[PDB]
Design a protein around this ligand. Structure first.
Ligand SMILES: [Ca+2]
Ligand SMILES: [Ca+2]
Ligand SMILES: [Ca+2]
Ligand SMILES: [Ca+2]
Ligand SMILES: [Ca+2]
Ligand SMILES: [Ca+2]
Ligand SMILES: [Ca+2]
Ligand SMILES: [Ca+2]
Ligand SMILES: [Cl-]
Length: 260
């Protein structure tokens, strides 16, 4: 696929996967779009989508209780509510906007576990995603291990189904859309590569082997039709570091291609 994207791989010593489709211009850009990467926290809005797809109003307002023992690493929001519980919508908010890991687990559990969520996503057309573990084990990202992986094209396409297509009732679609727009963890990634005044919804991820991902939707200023985008990346070494600038630069290249 795209040639400036290839240069980024050498610059940052990574394997890079990119898929972006401009729904207005009817054009896409891709690079290694069918190669597997660990999705890490980017699964969270897909789990929220599946919840908003399959649960009743009552089920969304139901209080979910959990114990101190249930808390996994990095659970800033859920660790505040052990005694009283949280609703699925509050859990969704925490998972998407703060990347709360226990919130991720509560979503997986609500959907019947990773394998059941996988089956739900199969049924809306995602033939690619392979889900198996809970947080934080799902972040391992061992190369060649299929567990908890997808591709840039599949992540983008499935996000598109929930956010832009008709899988969700319009009211619930807006709830998900606003959680993504109000994400707090992505300022240095896709958001950093988009012009001022454009609206972005996104979900970031980070994990083993230097994995660094961001998926989202970009609405160019002026009511233009949206661009769906997924950027995934990983490195050779188990304890490798990532560089957020990779994601910003990939975004800039995508927009140069799509918008020109
Ligand atoms: Ca179109
Ligand atoms: Ca391609
Ligand atoms: Ca703890
Ligand atoms: Ca499909
Ligand atoms: Ca599975
Ligand atoms: Ca399994
Ligand atoms: Ca409904
Ligand atoms: Ca409703
Ligand atoms: Cl399972």
């Amino acid at each position: 696929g795209s040639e400036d994207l290839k240069k980024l791989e050498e610059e940052f010593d990574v394997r890079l996967g990119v898929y972006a489709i401009d729904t207005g211009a009817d054009k896409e850009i891709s690079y290694r779009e069918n190669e597997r990467f660990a999705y890490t926290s980017t699964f969270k809005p897909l789990a929220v989508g599946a919840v908003l797809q399959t649960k009743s109003d009552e089920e969304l307002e139901e209080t979910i209780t959990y114990s101190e023992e249930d808390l996994v690493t990095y659970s800033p929001i859920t660790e505040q509510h052990v005694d009283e519980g949280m609703t699925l919508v509050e859990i969704a908010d925490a998972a998407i906007r703060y990347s709360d890991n226990t919130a991720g687990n509560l979503l997986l559990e609500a959907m019947g576990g990773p394998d059941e969520l996988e089956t739900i996503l199969r049924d809306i057309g995602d033939e690619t995603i392979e889900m198996d573990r809970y947080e934080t084990e799902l972040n391992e990202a061992k190369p060649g291990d299929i567990r908890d992986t997808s591709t840039a094209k599949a992540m983008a396409t499935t996000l598109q189904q929930y956010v832009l297509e008709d899988v969700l009732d319009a009211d619930r679609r807006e709830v998900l859309t606003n959680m993504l727009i109000n994400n707090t963890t992505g300022d240095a990634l896709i958001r950093a590569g988009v012009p001022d005044g454009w609206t972005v919804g996104d979900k970031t991820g980070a994990g083993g082997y230097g994995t660094r991902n961001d998926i989202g939707i970009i609405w160019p200023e002026g009511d233009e039709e949206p661009i769906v985008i997924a950027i995934m990346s990983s490195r050779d070494e188990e304890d490798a570091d990532y560089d957020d600038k990779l994601i910003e630069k990939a975004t800039e290249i995508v927009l140069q291609e799509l918008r020109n």
